[model samples]
Target: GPGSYTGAGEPSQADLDALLSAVRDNRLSIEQAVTLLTPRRGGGSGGGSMDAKEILTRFKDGGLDRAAAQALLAGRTPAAAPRP
Candidate 1:
């Protein structure tokens, strides 16, 4: 670990950096990273959780929406976004 997160729920910059490294080094699996990155709400880790609540969520295509993340995680190509 690069360093430990001081806060309870909030993941720090170092946390993300270490997490990225862990994922790349095979210490963390995609599913594990997904679980860790999904932040809980109301003190529970159920349907109330959301990805953005834990980490900075973004699309590689920039134009794509949340669906792209879903597709990417599922190992499928994301559909082309509507032309601008």
Candidate 2:
């Protein structure tokens, strides 16, 4: 009952939309979104994965808005525009 397990889950259309929205809004960091979407716990220790719903819940729990979460997931990088 008290053991570790690994699993995978598919993300719904809405979930994908939310994440994408966050990316467009530039509210979340790519690293953070990756961590949330593909959460990886300990290695050679107790580890597990999170589903889409779980990921969203965690984002909200961390006070990250939908846009922020999306930004992080999208891995949005800074533009290379020429400086004025």
Candidate 3:
């Protein structure tokens, strides 16, 4: 992730030291932090744009009960329909 301390007078030595320490202590992993801080592709993943009820219905037919259907839907949102 980009830091607020880039140029001179932007961040004190102490601030940089603390940031490095935090990173080394396993409190922050560079890869994980980059993933979290990076902007998602296209600013959207095209997920969760459908009616929850419809998703639930499909799940129910796939042998899931109301509760399980709801749970699945809660975790993943539907994608946009593919172009014909």
Candidate 4:
């Protein structure tokens, strides 16, 4: 069973500290950090709409950093193309 320690909407500060420290130490890249911060598929190692919802849920729950979460949300749509 997958049990949770912390409550929803409250990401552990320790988690953030470790994550940020990794970045500072060059152990984690910004892109990698975002990926780690993002929610992964549940049940098994598998792969979008559901993923989107999860991201949104986590975003609301404060599981993700603001910019990182917003980036995932923003990416739901494609940017306007420069060329046809």
What is the number of residue pairs that collide in model 3? 0
Q: Candidate 4 regions off by >4 Å?
A: 1-9, 39-84
Model 3 Cα lDDT, one tens digit per residue, 1-84: 357865533223343344334444667554443343321222113543434344333543454443333333334322445999
Deviation of model 1 at 51, angstroms: 5.9
Please, what is the whole-model Cα lDDT of each candidate in the order they appear? 0.46, 0.47, 0.38, 0.50
Candidate 2 lDDT tens digits, 1-84? 224663534344466576545744667655555565664331221222323344455565665555444433333321335989
Please provide, for model 4 over 1-84, each residue's C-alpha lDDT reduced to its tens digit, 9 standing for 90 to 100: 235665455345455556665654666665566677654333212233335355444644567565554444434322334996
Model 3 root-mean-square deviation: 16.5
Quote the positional error of residue 72 for candidate 1 in Å: 14
* Candidate number achieving the greatest TM-score relative to the actual structure: 4
Each candidate: RMSD: 10.7, 11.6, 16.5, 11.4
Where does candidate 3 stray beyond 4 Å? 1-8, 31-84
- Comparing candidate 1 with candidate 2, which one achieves the higher lDDT? 2
Name the lDDT of candidate 2. Answer: 0.47
State which candidate, 3 or 4, has the greater TM-score.
Answer: 4
